[PDB]
Amino acid sequence: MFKAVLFDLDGVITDTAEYHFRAWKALAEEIGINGVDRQFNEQLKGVSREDSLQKILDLADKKVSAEEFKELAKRKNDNYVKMIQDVSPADVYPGILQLLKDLRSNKIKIALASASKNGPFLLERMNLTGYFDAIADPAEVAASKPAPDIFIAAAHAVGVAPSESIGLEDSQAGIQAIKDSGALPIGVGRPEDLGDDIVIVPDTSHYTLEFLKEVWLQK
Numbered sequence: 001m002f003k004a005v006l007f008d009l010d011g012v013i014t015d016t017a018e019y020h021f022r023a024w025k026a027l028a029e030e031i032g033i034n035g036v037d038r039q040f041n042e043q044l045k046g047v048s049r050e051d052s053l054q055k056i057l058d059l060a061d062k063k064v065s066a067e068e069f070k071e072l073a074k075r076k077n078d079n080y081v082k083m084i085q086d087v088s089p090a091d092v093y094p095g096i097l098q099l100l101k102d103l104r105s106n107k108i109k110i111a112l113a114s115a116s117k118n119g120p121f122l123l124e125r126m127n128l129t130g131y132f133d134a135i136a137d138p139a140e141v142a143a144s145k146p147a148p149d150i151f152i153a154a155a156h157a158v159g160v161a162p163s164e165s166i167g168l169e170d171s172q173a174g175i176q177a178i179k180d181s182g183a184l185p186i187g188v189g190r191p192e193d194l195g196d197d198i199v200i201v202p203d204t205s206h207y208t209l210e211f212l213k214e215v216w217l218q219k
């Protein structure tokens with residue numbers, strides 16, 4: 001009965017979080033902010049480039065001009081773009097390629113709901129461009145996760161209502177974003193991190209078309 005599946009990139013399709021964290025931590029340390037650790041990164045997980053930089057600057061109560069803000073964001077992005085040059089189809093998470101093919105076969109729309117402006121480049125690196133009907137443009141999204149914005153945009157991009165879609169995420173902020181969009185969340189990870197009120201799978205191999213069809217019938 002569902003018309004679309006809204007995929008986040010990070011933690012669902014491949015791991016980009018680790019590279020992003022290292023690049024943000026490196027930037028923070030260059031400008032004297034040493035508080036960007038794995039604990040603080042939970043507030044940074046899945047969040048846009050601009051909102052992630054502002055949260056890092058707020059940690060040390062640092063004031064910058066608009067030109068300086070854009071220079072810091074560009075500096076980190078250049079570092080991140082270098083880190084991901086070697087991303088290949090071998091980096092696609094287990095079960096994801098088969099799920100995409102099975103959704104395409106059943107005429108179910110596929111959309112990306114990532115806050116990353118590097119999303120199209122990453123799907124190209126992984127040879128997944130053809131499997132996506134639409135990619136939610138983060139440049140046209142005014143609020144980062146937990147806000148529903150990116151997931152609403154992902155659904156509208158494929159011509160469907162969020163209530164007619166399933167959202168896949170690995171983060172708490174992302175799951176809340178799917179809930180608030182109207183879409184049905186199916187998380188990948190642990191209940192203590194993602195929530196006890198949603199359907200959760202331990203890893204991406206469990207994300208099959210038949211599992212998604214069953215979760216939707218049981219809602």
Ligand SMILES: O=P(O)(O)O[C@H]1O[C@H](CO)[C@H](O)[C@H](O)[C@H]1O
Binds near residue numbers: 010048052114115118
């Ligand atoms: O727009 P990017 O800089 O490529 O990516 C932005 O969104 C992604 C979501 O996976 C991460 O939160 C990253 O830290 C952030 O900067």
Ligand SMILES: [Mg+2]
Binds near residue numbers: 008009169174
């Ligand atoms: Mg994610």
